[PDB]
Backbone as a chain_set.jsonl record, in Angstrom:
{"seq": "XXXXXXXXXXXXXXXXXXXXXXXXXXXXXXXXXXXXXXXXXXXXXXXXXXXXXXXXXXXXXXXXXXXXXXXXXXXXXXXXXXXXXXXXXXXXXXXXXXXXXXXXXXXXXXXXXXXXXXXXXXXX", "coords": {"N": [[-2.272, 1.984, -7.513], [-2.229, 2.935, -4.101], [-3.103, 5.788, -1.504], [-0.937, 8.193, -1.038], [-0.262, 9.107, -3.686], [-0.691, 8.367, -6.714], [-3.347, 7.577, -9.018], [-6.208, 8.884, -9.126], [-8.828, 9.651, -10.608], [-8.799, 11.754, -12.975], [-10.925, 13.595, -15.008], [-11.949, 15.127, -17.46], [-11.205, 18.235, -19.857], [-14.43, 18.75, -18.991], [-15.915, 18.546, -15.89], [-13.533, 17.609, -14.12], [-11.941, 16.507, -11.295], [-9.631, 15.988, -9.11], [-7.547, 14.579, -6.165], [-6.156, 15.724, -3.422], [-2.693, 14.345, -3.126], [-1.31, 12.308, -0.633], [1.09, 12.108, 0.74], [3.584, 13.377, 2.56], [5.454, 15.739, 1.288], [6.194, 17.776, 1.417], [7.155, 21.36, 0.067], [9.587, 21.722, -0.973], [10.481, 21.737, -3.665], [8.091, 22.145, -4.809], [6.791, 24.733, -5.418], [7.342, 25.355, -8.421], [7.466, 22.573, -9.124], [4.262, 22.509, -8.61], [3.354, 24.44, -10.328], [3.965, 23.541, -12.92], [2.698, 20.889, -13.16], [0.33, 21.649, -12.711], [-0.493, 23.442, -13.935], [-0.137, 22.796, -16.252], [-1.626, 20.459, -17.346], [-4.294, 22.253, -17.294], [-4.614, 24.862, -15.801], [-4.982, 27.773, -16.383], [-3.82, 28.272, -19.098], [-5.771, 26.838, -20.663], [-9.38, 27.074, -21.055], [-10.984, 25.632, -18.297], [-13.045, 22.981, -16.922], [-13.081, 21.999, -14.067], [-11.841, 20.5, -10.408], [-10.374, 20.455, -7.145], [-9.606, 18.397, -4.544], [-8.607, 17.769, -1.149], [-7.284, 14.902, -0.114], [-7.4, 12.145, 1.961], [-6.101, 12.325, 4.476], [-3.569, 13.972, 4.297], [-2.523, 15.849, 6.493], [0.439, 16.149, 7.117], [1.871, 15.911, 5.127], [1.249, 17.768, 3.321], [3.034, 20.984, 2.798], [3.223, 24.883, 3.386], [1.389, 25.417, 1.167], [-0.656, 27.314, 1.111], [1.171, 29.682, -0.005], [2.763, 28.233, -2.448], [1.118, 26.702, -3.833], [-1.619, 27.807, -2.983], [-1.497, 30.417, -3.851], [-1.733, 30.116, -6.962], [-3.826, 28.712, -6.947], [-6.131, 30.391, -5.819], [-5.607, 32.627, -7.584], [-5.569, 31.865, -10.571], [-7.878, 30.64, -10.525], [-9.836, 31.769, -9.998], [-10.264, 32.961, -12.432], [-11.539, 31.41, -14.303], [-13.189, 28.321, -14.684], [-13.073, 26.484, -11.935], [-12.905, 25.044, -9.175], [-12.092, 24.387, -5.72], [-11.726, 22.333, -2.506], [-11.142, 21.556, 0.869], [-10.627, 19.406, 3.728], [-10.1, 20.594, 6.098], [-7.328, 20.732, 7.373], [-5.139, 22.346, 8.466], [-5.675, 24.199, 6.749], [-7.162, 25.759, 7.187], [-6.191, 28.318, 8.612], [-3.766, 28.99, 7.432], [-4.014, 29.168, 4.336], [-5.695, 31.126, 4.542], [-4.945, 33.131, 6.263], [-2.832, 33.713, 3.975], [-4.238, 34.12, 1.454], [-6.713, 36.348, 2.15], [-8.372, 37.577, 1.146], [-10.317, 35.936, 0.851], [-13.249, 36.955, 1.745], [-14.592, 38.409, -0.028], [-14.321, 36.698, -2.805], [-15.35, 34.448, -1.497], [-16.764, 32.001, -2.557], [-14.702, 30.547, -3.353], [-12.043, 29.286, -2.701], [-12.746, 26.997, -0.762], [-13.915, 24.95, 1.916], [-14.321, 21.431, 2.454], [-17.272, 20.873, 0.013], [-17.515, 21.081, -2.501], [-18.208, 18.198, -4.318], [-20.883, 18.585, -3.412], [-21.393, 20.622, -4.536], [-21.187, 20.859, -7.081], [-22.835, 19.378, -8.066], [-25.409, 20.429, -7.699], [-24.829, 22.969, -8.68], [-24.297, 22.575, -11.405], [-26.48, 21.581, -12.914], [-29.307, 22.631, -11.723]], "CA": [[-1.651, 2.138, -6.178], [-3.16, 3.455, -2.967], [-1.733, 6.612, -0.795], [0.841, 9.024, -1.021], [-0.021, 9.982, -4.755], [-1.846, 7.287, -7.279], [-4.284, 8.552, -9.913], [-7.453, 9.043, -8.49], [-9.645, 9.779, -11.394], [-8.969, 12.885, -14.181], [-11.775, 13.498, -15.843], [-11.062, 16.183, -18.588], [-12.382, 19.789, -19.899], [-15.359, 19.314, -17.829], [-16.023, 17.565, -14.738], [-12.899, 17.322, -13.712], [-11.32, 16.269, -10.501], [-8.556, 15.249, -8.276], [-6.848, 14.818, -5.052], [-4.641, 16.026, -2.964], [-1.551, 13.119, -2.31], [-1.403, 12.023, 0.379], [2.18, 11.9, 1.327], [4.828, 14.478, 2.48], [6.612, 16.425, 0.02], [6.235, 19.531, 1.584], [6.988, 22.244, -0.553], [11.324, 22.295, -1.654], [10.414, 22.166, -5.26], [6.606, 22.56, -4.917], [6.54, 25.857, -6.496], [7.592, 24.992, -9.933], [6.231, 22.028, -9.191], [2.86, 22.687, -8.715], [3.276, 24.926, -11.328], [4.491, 22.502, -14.039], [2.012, 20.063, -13.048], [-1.213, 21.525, -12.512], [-0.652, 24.256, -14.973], [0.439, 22.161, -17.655], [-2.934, 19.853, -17.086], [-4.096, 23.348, -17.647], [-5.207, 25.899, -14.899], [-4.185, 29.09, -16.401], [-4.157, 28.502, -20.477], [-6.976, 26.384, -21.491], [-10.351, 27.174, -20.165], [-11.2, 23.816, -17.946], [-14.069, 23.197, -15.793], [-12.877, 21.056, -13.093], [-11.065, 20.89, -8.918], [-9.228, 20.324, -6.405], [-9.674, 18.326, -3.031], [-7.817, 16.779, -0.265], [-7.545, 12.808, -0.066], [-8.044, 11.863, 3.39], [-4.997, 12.931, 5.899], [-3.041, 15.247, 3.566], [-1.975, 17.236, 6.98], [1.84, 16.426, 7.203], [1.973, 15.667, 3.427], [1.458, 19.14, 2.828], [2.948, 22.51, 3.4], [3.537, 26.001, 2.418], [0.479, 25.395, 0.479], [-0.809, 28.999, 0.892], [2.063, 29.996, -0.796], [2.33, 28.087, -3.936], [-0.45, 25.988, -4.109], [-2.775, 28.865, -2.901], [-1.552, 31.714, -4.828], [-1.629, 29.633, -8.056], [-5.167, 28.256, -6.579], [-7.082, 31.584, -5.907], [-5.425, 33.47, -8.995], [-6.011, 30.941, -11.956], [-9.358, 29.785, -9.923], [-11.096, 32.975, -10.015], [-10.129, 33.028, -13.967], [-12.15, 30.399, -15.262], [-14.567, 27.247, -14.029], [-12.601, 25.821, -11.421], [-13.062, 24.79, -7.703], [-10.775, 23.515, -4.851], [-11.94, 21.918, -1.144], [-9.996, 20.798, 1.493], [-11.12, 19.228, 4.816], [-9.36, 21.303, 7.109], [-6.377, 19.864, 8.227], [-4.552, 23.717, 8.914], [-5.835, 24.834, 5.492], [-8.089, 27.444, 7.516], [-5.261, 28.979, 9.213], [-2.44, 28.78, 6.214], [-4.874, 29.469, 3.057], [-6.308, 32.246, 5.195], [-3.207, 34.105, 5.925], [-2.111, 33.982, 2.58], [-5.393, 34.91, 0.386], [-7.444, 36.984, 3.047], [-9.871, 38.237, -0.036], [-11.611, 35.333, 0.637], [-14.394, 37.574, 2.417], [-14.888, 39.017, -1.347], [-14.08, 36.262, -3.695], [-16.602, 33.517, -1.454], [-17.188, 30.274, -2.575], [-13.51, 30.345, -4.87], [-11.658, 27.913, -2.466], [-13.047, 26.533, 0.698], [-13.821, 23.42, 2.542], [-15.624, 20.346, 2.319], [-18.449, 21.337, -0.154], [-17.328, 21.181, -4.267], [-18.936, 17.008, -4.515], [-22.627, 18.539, -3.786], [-21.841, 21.844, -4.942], [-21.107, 20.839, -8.845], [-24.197, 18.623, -8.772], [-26.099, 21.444, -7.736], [-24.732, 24.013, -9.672], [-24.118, 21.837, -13.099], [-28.112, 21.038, -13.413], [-30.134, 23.799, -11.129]], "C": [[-2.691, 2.628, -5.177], [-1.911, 4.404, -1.794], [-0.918, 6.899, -1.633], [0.494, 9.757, -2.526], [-1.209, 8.891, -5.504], [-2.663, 8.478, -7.973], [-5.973, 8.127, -9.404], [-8.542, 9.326, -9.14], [-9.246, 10.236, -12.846], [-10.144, 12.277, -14.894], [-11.434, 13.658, -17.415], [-11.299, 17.053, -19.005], [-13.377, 19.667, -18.451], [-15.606, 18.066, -17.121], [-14.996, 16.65, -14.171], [-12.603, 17.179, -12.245], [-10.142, 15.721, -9.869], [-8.232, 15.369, -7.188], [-6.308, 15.04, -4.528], [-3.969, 14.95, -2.68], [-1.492, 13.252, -1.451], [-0.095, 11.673, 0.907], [3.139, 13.36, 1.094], [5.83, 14.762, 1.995], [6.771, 17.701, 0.28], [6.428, 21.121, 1.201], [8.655, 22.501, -1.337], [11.013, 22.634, -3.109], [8.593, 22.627, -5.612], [6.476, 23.369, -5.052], [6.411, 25.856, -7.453], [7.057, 23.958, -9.612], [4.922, 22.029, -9.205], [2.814, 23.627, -10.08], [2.864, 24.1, -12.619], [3.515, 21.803, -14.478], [0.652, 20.614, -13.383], [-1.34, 22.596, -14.215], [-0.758, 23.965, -16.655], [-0.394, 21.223, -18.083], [-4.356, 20.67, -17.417], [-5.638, 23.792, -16.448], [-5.369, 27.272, -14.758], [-4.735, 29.233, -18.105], [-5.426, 28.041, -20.945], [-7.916, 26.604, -20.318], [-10.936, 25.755, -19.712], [-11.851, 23.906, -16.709], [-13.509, 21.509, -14.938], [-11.827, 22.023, -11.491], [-10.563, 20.111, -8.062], [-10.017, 19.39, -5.176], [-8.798, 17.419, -2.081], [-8.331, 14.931, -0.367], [-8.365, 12.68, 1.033], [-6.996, 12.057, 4.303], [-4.634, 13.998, 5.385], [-2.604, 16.585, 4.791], [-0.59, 17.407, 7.099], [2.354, 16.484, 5.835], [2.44, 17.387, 2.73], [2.078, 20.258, 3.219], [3.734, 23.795, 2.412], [2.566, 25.951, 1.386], [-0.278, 26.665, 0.031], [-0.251, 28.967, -0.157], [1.771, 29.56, -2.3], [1.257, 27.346, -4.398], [-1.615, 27.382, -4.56], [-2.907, 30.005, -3.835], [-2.048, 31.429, -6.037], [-3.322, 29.066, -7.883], [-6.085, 29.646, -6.882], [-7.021, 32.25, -7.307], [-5.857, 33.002, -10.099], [-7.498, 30.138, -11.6], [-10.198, 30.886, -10.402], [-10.965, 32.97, -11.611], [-10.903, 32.62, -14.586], [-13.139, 29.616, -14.473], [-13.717, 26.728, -12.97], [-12.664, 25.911, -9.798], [-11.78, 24.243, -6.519], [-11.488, 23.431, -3.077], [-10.578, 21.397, -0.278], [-11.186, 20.474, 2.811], [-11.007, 19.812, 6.226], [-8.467, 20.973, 7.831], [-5.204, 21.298, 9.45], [-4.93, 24.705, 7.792], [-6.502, 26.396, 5.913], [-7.128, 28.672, 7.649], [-4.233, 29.241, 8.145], [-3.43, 29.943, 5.099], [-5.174, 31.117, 3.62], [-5.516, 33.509, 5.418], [-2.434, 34.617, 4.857], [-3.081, 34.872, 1.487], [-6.634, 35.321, 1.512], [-8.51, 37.994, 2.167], [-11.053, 37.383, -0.015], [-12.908, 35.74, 0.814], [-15.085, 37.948, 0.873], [-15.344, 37.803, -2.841], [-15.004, 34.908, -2.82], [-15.982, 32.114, -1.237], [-15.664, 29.964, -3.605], [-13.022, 29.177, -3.672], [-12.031, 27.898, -0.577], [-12.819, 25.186, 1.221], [-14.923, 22.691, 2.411], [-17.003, 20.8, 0.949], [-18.739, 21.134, -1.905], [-18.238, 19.483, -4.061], [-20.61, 17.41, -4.711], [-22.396, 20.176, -4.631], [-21.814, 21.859, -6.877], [-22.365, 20.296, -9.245], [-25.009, 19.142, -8.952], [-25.97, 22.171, -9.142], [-24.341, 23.718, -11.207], [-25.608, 21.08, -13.62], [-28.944, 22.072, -12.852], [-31.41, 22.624, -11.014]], "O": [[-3.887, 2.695, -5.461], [-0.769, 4.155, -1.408], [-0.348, 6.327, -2.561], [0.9, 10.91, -2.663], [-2.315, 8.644, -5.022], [-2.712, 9.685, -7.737], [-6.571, 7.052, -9.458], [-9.528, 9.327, -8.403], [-9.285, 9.454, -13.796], [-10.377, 11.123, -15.251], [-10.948, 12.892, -18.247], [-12.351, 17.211, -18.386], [-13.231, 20.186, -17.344], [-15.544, 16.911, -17.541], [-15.161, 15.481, -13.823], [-13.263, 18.073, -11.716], [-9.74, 14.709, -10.444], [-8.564, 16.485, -6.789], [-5.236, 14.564, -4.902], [-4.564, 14.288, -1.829], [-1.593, 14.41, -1.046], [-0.181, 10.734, 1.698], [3.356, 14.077, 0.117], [6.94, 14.247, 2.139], [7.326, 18.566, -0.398], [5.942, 22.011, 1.899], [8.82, 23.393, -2.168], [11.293, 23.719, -3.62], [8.143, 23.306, -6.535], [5.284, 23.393, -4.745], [5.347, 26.331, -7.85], [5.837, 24.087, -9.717], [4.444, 21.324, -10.094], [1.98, 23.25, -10.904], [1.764, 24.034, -13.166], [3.192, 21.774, -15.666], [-0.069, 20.093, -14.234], [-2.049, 22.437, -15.209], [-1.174, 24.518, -17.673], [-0.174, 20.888, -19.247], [-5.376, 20.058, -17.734], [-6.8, 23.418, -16.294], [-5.691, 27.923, -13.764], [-5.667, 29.954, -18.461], [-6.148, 28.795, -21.597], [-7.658, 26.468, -19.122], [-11.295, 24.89, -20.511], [-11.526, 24.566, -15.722], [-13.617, 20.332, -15.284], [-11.386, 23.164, -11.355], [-10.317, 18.948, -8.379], [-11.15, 19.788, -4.905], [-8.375, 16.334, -2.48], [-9.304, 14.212, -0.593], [-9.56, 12.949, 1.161], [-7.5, 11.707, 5.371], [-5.142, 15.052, 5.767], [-2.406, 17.763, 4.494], [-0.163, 18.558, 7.19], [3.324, 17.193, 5.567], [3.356, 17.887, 2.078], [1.571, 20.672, 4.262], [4.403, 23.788, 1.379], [2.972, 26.608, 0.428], [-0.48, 26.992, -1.138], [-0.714, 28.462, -1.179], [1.011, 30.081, -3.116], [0.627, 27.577, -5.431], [-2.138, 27.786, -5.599], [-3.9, 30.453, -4.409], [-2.83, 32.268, -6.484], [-3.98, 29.075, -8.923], [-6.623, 29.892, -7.962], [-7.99, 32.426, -8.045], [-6.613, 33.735, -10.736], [-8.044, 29.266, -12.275], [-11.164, 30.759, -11.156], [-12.119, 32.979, -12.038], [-11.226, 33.265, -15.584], [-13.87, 30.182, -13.66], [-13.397, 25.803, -13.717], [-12.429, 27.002, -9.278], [-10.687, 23.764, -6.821], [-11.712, 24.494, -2.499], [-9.465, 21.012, -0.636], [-12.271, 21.043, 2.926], [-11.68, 19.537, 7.219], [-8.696, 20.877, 9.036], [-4.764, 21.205, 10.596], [-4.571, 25.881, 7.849], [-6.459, 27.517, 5.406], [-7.207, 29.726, 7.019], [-3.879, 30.387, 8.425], [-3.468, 31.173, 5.142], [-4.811, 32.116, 2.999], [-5.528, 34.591, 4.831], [-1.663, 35.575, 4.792], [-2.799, 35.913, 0.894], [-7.512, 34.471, 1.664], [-9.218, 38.916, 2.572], [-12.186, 37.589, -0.449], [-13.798, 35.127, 0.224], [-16.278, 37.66, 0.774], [-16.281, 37.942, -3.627], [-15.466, 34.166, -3.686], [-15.276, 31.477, -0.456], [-15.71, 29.15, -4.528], [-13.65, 28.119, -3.719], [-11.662, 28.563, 0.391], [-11.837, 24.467, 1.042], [-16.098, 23.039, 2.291], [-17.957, 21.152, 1.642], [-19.842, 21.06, -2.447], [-19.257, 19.75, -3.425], [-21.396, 16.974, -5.553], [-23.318, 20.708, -5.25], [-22.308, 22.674, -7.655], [-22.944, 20.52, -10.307], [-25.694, 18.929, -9.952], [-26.596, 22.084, -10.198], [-24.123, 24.6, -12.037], [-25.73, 20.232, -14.504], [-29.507, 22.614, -13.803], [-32.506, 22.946, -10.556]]}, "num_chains": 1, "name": "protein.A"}
C-alpha cells in the first residue's frame, strides 16, 4: 500500500525502524493502542535496538501524542537502544509540554536526525 499506515520496512533486534502513519486516528484508543502495538513488537520487555520516525505529513494524523505515544516513547526509550525523530509538525510544542526533561535526557527523542545519527553512532 502507500499512506495512511502500510509497512514501511521492520527490520528486527537491531537496526530497526519505522514510521509514523500517515493518517488520522488521533488518539480514542491510542493509548492501549500504542501500547499493544509497539510494546508487543517489544519496547519495554525485550532489549531491541531500533526507532521511530514520522512519514511525511503525519500533522492531522496524529494527536495527543505527548501523552501516550510520548510517555511510552521517553520512558521505555531511555531503557534500552532505541531512538524516535519526528519532523516537526507540532511535535516541538506537544512532546515538549509533556516530557520537559528533555534538557537532561538530550538526544532520547528529537527531530530530524536518527538516519545519520545510527550510521554514525553504529560504526564511529
Amino acid at each position: 500500500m502507500h499512506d495512511i499506515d502500510d509497512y514501511p520496512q521492520a527490520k528486527r533486534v537491531p537496526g530497526l525502524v519505522v514510521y509514523r502513519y500517515d493518517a488520522p486516528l488521533c488518539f480514542a484508543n491510542a493509548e492501549d493502542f500504542r501500547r499493544r502495538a509497539l510494546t508487543v513488537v517489544d519496547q519495554d520487555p525485550g532489549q531491541v535496538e531500533w526507532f521511530v520516525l514520522n512519514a511525511e505529513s503525519n500533522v492531522e494524523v496524529d494527536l495527543t501524542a505527548l501523552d501516550a505515544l510520548d510517555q511510552l516513547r521517553t520512558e521505555l526509550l531511555r531503557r534500552g537502544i532505541v531512538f524516535a525523530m519526528a519532523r516537526v509538525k507540532q511535535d516541538l510544542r506537544e512532546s515538549l509540554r509533556a516530557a520537559s526533561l528533555l534538557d537532561k535526557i538530550g538526544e532520547d527523542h528529537i527531530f530530524m536526525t536518527l538516519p545519520t545519527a545510527v550510521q554514525a553512532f553504529r560504526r564511529r
